[PDB]
Ligand binder design. Sequence first.
Ligand code: MET
Ligand code: NA
Length: 237
Amino acid sequence: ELKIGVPLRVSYKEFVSQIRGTENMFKGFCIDVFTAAVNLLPYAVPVKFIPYGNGKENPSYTHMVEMITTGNFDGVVGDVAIVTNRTKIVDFTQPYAASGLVVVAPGGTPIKGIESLRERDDPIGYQVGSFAESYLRNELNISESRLVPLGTPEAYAKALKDGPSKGGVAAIVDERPYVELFLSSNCAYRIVGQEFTKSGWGFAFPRDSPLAIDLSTAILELAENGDLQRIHDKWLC
Ligand code: MET
Ligand code: NA
């Protein structure tokens, strides 16, 4: 069998979540896609899902991926952004889900885009364990004293209500899917500007995995037969 790493998410469980009272059993949008995908394969792929994470906070998805390279996982399935530093060390499938960083702020703030957020001094929220933190420090070079980790959508909504003047944030930077779910229950906020990364979600496998390529093709069949939008509709103003 394959030891497949699965992120142990504490928020936005609609994507990936451990079943309560199990350790190797998972449900969510990402699992269902992955299952469907393996079924279209011409051969059998036995998997054992292994949780990655302490169950208190969302794990570092980059460290989770690294476990493939240390030979601890034969692969990783979850809501994993295909980003450049990760692609350097493993082989992702093609994106089964489109994603990309956006700015979420209250309707009618002075913050209109990523650009206007950078030039200010005000604090920014990011999701705990997201590559977002790395991007904000290295590519956009925003000071670490401005970045505020946030574990849950409740945490999101609080830091936005509180605002900068009450140890909250002026805005949150996060991948659209999480943002879209958050806004379902919090219509008071909006995505200012456009998407400013095109990093999609994929399944991670060791460099030179025939699995990675064969599933990339599988994902396409699911998209053409409308099963991707079907599974989306089933899990996800
Ligand atoms: C805890 S949310 C992190 C998910 C994000 N796609 C990442 O891969 O870093
Ligand atoms: Na084979």
